[PDB]
Amino acid sequence: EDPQLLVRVRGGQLRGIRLKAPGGPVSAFLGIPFAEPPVGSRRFMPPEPKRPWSGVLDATTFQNVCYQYVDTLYPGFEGTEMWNPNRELSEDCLYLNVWTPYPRPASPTPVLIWIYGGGFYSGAASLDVYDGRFLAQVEGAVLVSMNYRVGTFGFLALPGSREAPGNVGLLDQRLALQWVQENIAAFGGDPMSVTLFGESAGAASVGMHILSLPSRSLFHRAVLQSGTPNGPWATVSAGEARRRATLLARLVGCNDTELIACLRTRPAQDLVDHEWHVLPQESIFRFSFVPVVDGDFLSDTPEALINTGDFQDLQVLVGVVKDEGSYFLVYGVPGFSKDNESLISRAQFLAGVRIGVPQASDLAAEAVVLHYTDWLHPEDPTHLRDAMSAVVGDHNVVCPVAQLAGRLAAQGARVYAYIFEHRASTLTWPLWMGVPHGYEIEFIFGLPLDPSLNYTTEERIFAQRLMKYWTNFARTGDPNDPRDSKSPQWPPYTTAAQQYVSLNLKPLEVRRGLRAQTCAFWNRFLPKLLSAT
Amino acid sequence: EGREDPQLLVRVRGGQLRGIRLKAPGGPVSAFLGIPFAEPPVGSRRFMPPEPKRPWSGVLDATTFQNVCYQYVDTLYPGFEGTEMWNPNRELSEDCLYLNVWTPYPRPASPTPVLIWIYGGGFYSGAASLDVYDGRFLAQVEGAVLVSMNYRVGTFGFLALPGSREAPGNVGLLDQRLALQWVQENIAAFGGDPMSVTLFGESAGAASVGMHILSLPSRSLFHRAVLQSGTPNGPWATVSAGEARRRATLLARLVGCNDTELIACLRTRPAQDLVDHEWHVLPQESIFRFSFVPVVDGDFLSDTPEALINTGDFQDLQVLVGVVKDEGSYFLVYGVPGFSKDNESLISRAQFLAGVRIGVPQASDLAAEAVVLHYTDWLHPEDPTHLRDAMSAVVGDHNVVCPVAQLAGRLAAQGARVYAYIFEHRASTLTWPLWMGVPHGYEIEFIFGLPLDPSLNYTTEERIFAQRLMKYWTNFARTGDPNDPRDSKSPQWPPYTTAAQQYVSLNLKPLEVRRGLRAQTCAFWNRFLPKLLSA
């Protein structure tokens, strides 16, 4: 049969499948195992390289989604189900996919590795929004995406113990990164030009591979979309991780060795049934089992590592969307709903601030309220609704992104920053949510170029601009086209000028100040306050 | 009596007075200067409340200004008009409780509304005889009856050992009240209507006006109030009884002194000796802080000014309040390193933080950090021009603009009729540097109508502008409304409300309505900083 779909990696032979993109065919290799299935005795354990196989392994199908929590808030609603697993759940899930142009590239091609998001408790590399078909066909890119263990199976930790050291979900990603080093050349990819890019928890994971040295020799450039390793949600301390793991074992009827042995004896859903019951406070944008500051993978807190690291030969692309926190409000904040316009009172606004900032003392809570209050219209329900979205967005994404971009730029790194402001015509969420958390991904991957999904012609051309931005950054470390000269260049973000650009259908517009005033409150003041308590 | 001007002889409760016919740009005015309204608070009466003036025999000559109350004299810029125009222009003496009256010439037939001026000067300086307080223009052009009194300042007016009998405190405010009583009894002899008495003052005079609003024995002596760049509430206008006692007992130590024995010693000290040590009793290195100010004594002020404006009914009451564009720039050249009137005062970020500790002397390390980060321009956090302007805004907002914004909001929500303004025009005659903008107190010369005097080298637009302000002030005195019913062709001045927060801009252009008086920044000063200062 077709030899273009027959590849030999270090573990055996694979059979790909020629898929059809709007502009031509592409070779896809879906479901390649990169690790032994972490089942039974290997639950909570670091992954290990997949053993070789005999014959021709069929790599034409998406494998199983890592066992994870499934959303139940809006059943049947496209806005939530598009992130739900599209394959059967299983702890046997350490598989990756490779897209490449058809025919296989003649020259070594830069590789983009996608790390999906989902709050470290959900997500899969098989969702339609992560379809590397278009980037491989239009830009000739070799695109890689891997599944990593999420939730308890990927990040339940009893720090110091050996049967649950923590961060094994991140170690899954690193093992797939080494698999790319050892095998992507057989697909036409260049192992010396590997760019990691991910969104939300995937962006945070990308940032942690920057801050973990064994991972750094596996990639060269990074893209962090709406997520950072630093911040209030991406990591936990060893003491808090041990508390949540112990409380989870108590809720399921379970010396560290004997405790984890008991945890290895329960169905996967038994653990998922109680993973949301370990958070210390009523919260939104807080996740139970996330990466842990273990002194191993993360030698110190992300804030400490970005404050003192040498990033001179690293190039990064960071950015946010226009409404980072609007999505999260309907998941625990009284007065918000996707169906009504969520015009809240003021008493609701303060009650929501205690949920959006669950670590804030009463004084720190008031400081947030008085800061985001429009003191000319202190009770106009439209602003307090929009302000509540801004509190969660700025606290968890925007200002953590601003602090990271400044620290990287200050210590040698080459930083490009953006804000994504276009709202998709196909969006099914209400308009008061604006551009919600994660709705730039479909444009980066080039989905508007599929005529069957009913995007506007300008959205189709907008997606092409973003694909060229990302691939140019992967090819060169610079998102600017070295072909098209043209009036406005995307300038590097610096600590002095603080320049970033806006990604919408209008041409590039350079702005200065990534919410410098508001993020000064979050990054500089509020740490000193949560200290006066 | 016999060969004199019959239009200039008046009798008051204490005897007869001979006024003087003064010349104004567009006609003559009657002036009665140096009318004694109290027994000289000298000797054993130092620090004591004022007593009413015992009647005199014969005709008292009321043709020249009397003595200025003993006070500190500013000598930071010798011979510089910007500082000299506020210095005493008469002899310094503890014998200083005298007031002045300006009326049209001849004196009006029907009763005329009365404007009473209370000067400012941080409760340590000031005089009713300064040229910028000349009431001849308001009396000639607007036909108003203007009164201004001298009150004791500094230690002589506000040194207090609360609870004692020999130094009860607030005697400088009692000097003002006694003059308001003098107006109630005697202003009818000049053509003034004692049932239409409007108080107006600036800086500490505006604070004094506010304290008469919050003190009941004074509130029966007037009907309307104007507060220019000053409030009874705020960080500088008052001190607690314990702090006033501490500053008073410390000053006594610094000059060589049971309260009775202590004050008996202070009364034996020369007046200049108290002035020489007046500034040595401040708790910290500070600007816009004054050693001896009104004390919360549970008597004149039953509670703090903040407590009384929060719990007080003001439905009966119309006020005009406002600020100038640069309230704090004046005070920076008086203690903040890096600022001078002779250079551009471009400062570094380090000097900006050093100044924040001086401008906010009561702030902890954390509170001072909140001010610095709030006022920092994070796109140019080391630009010396913004840092210098931020330092001016910190002092101006903390001491004036936000206390005024706090006062207008509380009074309006409690039923009062409030009109608010921001004075934005810089006098073409200003001798201060341009970077100071419109400094503290440089709207007074326009409200009193000094640009009408042709010899003062003002522009013609400034003369027209001054006339427009005089009518704003006098219409509010006449009606409780600065607006003109004789002219609907000019834009109207809406009251300040909690809903709309409307105020107007006072400059060389027609009235322009604005919303919110620095709402975001003053929420930090008025709402957040007090709560954080509890830590």
From Swiss-Prot, chain B:
PROSITE patterns: CARBOXYLESTERASE_B_1 (PS00122), CARBOXYLESTERASE_B_2 (PS00941). Glycans are attached at residues 258, 343, 457. Disulfide bonds join 69-96, 257-265, 402-522. It is a peripheral membrane protein. Keywords: Cell membrane, Disulfide bond, Glycoprotein, GPI-anchor, Hydrolase, Lipoprotein, Membrane, Neurotransmitter degradation, Secreted, Serine esterase, Signal, Synapse. The active site is at residues 203, 327, 440. Belongs to the type-B carboxylesterase/lipase family. This is Acetylcholinesterase. The lineage of its organism: Eukaryota, Metazoa, Chordata, Craniata, Vertebrata.
